[PDB]
Amino acid sequence: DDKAACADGIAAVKARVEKLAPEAVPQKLKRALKIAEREQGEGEFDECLEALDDAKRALP
Amino acid sequence: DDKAACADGIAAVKARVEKLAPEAVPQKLKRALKIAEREQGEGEFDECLEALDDAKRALP
């Protein structure tokens, strides 16, 4: 479900980001990941999924 | 708009609650108000409006 997709998507995005130079991770990507994790912690897994799309559009 | 409705609704609910004995304010009403204020602070005014409905359904 959305809860499962949210957790998997956070891991997926972080997997991609972990292959970037840390000094080249854009701030907007970090902000989007933290929004996704905030919404995940609030139980709003649908909003987590929407923040992950922002995060994916922030990847170089 | 929703931002305006959210702020007005928080004030309205608190106005009703301020006319209750503090020891008789139900915990679920407090929790709903704090969720509404959290979502307001996050800029999710539509979700604030939905938490206010929960708050209103919690009034004695």
Ligand SMILES: [Ce+3]
């Ligand atoms: Ce939220």
